[PDB]
Amino acid sequence: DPSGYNPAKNNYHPVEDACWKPGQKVPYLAVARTFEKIEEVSARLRMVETLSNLLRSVVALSPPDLLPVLYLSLNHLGPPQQGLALGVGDGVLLKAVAQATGRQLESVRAEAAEKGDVGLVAENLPPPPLTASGVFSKFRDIARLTGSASTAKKIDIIKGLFVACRHSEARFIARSLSGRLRLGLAEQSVLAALSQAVSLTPPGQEFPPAMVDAGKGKTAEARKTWLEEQGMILKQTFCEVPDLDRIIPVLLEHGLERLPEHCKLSPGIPLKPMLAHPTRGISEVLKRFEEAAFTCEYKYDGQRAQIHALEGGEVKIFSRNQADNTGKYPDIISRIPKIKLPSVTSFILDTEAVAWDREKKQIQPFQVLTTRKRKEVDASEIQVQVCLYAFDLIYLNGESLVREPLSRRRQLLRENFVETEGEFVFATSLDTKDIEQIAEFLEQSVKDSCEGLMVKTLDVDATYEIAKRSHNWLKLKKDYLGVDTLDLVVIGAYLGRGKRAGRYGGFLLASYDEDSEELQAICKLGTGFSDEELEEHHQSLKALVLPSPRPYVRIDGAVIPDHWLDPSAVWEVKCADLSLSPIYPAARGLVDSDKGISLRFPRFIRVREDKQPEQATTSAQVACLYRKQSQ
DNA sequence: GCTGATGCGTG
DNA sequence: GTCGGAC
DNA sequence: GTCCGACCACGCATCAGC
């Protein structure tokens, strides 16, 4: 009986403690019971072992079901470059639930709003039981439905799943479709559970499997270092080929030990890019990179593009999340020969695409780049020009450059590539350790329309290895310094979801329009406060609940706050930039004729108890802050 | 054919 | 993206 | 420090209802 399946028992036997026969399809309730045990604990070490127990039973009994179970656990549909997306949201999901329970959509919509979890409403004649691969095929079938009346087709599949659901199957299918599994376990823990599973229970054994638990004849210290060494092999190879459709086949057959010899970095597949960590200032940069030679480069405000050119001329462009953006940039595919030297037969660039004005010969804000069509095969109809800015090289002429230091990759990029000014240029850099020089570079960055400075080491720990440290690069932006702040008034709250059910999740802020004597909604706020401050906010603003909004509050199309608050609390909010808002009324008409101003990356700092709603940041001040920026 | 609502995907 | 929490 | 999931603004692309 799969209802009693407990993949969290001590001395879990992969074969006996299972809930399906060998050769049979993995039941979804097995996966559902595993998710339940994962969300009932809080330690990742406990989550990983619980998931690996299921993975061991799968690899030992039903090998072909390994990929669906992994993708179901990851709440994904396939490789990122495929681009499959459910297209199902809350409304479609709630509507599909309402058809399964016969309740009015308002009753189902009110339940999920107060509970913060749609899966609870879904769980609150018998078809055959749901299978793991069968449910995964239904998810992919939903994602392929396009064209008119496709939504009604999606609802029938979702309705069909909820009819064949048993116990917690309705809660997790609803959470999966909602894109909010709330599992506490994601890509890092999934890979750890997979490496532990195939090392404890090796794949490819004739049933009954001869080996099930290789940690038996080894001390706990050896078992720990053995699992962590094996897990690192899976990490780095997945960081070079983040594609389970290509790793799991090789792994199930050639083993994890020989995996790197086959799943290898080649031009054409998107690899995991290098990320950055925020630093409070140059003092933190010299402290973290002490006795280490680092280089400073501008942090361009745009879209990271990973250009692959295979041996043969085929050029492919991927985003930072391995999403295929070839058709989005036909202007880059023609520019390829004008950048590479004749000695360049295959390469992988790490560039930052930014909007470029062909007339003024200057950079344009990130908002102008987002106005670019994503399926614009018409190369002549491109209106917003883009200038590339390479800052790293990972592949060159059939060779992988991951194990090389950044100083070596810099010399190879700066030599085999030419700067066609206005179209391709090396990122502005400066190699120094003087605080005065780094300060002028960061100030010139904001002067040259940039977000700040990137700090990367040149030799020590300067490898492009994600599995080692995923944030070896350092982020030095102006809003981190100090050097934003805006003092805004709260006008309403929003109900919380997930880890915020029963509390306040989002808040609606407003500035003061002196010439109109009205509060104008400026942005929303949902981060920067601690759980203790959130309780103080939910307690202080408790007595200020209003049934209807005040007549001097103007939110325009902003999401109507679920709780209209009396205007009496002033908060200090920090942002990265002032944006021209197509949705908010703050300072509308002061800069643009019909667009207000909102905040980019808002965050909470402190509650200004000294100030009162009249003594807040004016929309005129907000308009001046936006104009003072280097547009 | 249009439009508002919305899903997705960045950053 | 920015942020805090739990480990 | 790591991993995860709360949360933000905003653009294109899509589709039900008209």
Side-chain angles (χ1 to χ4, degrees), chain A residues 587-601:
Chain A
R588 183 159 51 200
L590 271 49
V591 199
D592 186 289
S593 57
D594 285 317
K595 283 182 173 181
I597 266 59
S598 190
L599 314 201
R600 189 196 193 169
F601 309 147

Side-chain angles (χ1 to χ4, degrees), chain A residues 318-327 329-335 337 341-356 362 364-372 374 379 384 386-392 395 397-398 400-402 404-405 407-410 413 416-417 419-420 422 424 426-429 431-432 437 439 441 444 448 450-452 454 456-457 459-464 466-467 470-474 477 479-482 486-488 490-513 515 518-534 536-538 540 543-544 546-553 556-564 566-567 569-573 575-577:
Chain A
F318 299 96
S319 63
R320 92 157 194 84
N321 294 329
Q322 299 82 58
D324 198 340
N325 294 155
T326 55
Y329 295 147
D331 39 0
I332 307 296
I333 310 200
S334 74
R335 192 182 298 172
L341 287 187
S343 177
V344 185
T345 173
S346 64
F347 75 90
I348 286 180
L349 279 166
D350 201 6
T351 206
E352 180 77 15
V354 298
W356 184 257
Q362 218 74 319
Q364 301 183 260
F366 177 74
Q367 294 177 128
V368 198
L369 216 168
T370 52
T371 62
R372 288 186 39 54
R374 284 126 201 196
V384 176
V386 173
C387 181
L388 292 185
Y389 286 109
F391 53 85
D392 221 316
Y395 203 96
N397 302 335
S400 173
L401 278 36
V402 157
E404 296 290 334
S407 36
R408 180 95 198 110
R409 311 190 300 264
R410 147 182 294 272
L413 169 61
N416 299 89
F417 292 85
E419 284 177 316
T420 306
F424 178 90
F426 305 137
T428 305
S429 38
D431 314 332
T432 187
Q437 284 186 298
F441 209 29
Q444 194 71 25
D448 298 4
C450 297
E451 295 182 333
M454 289 268 82
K456 336 203 202 82
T457 62
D459 287 321
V460 45
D461 299 323
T463 175
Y464 209 96
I466 293 322
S470 57
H471 303 132
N472 265 328
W473 299 359
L474 288 190
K477 290 170 63 183
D479 45 316
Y480 297 151
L481 315 178
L486 283 70
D487 294 68
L488 308 168
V490 316
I491 58 179
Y494 301 88
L495 275 306
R497 300 193 296 168
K499 308 204 285 166
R500 298 283 195 66
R503 309 159 96 181
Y504 286 149
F507 290 62
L508 190 53
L509 309 148
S511 60
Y512 189 86
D513 194 15
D515 48 67
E518 59 174 1
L519 291 178
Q520 300 171 291
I522 182 165
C523 73
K524 303 173 70 189
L525 208 65
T527 196
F529 30 62
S530 69
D531 291 9
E532 200 176 44
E533 298 170 352
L534 203 288
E536 296 182 10
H537 297 345
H538 200 328
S540 301
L544 278 62
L546 289 180
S548 302
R550 287 273 188 253
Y552 50 97
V553 163
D556 192 313
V559 179
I560 289 85
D562 315 323
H563 279 24
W564 283 107
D566 209 15
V570 194
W571 289 357
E572 179 177 14
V573 176
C575 64
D577 289 305

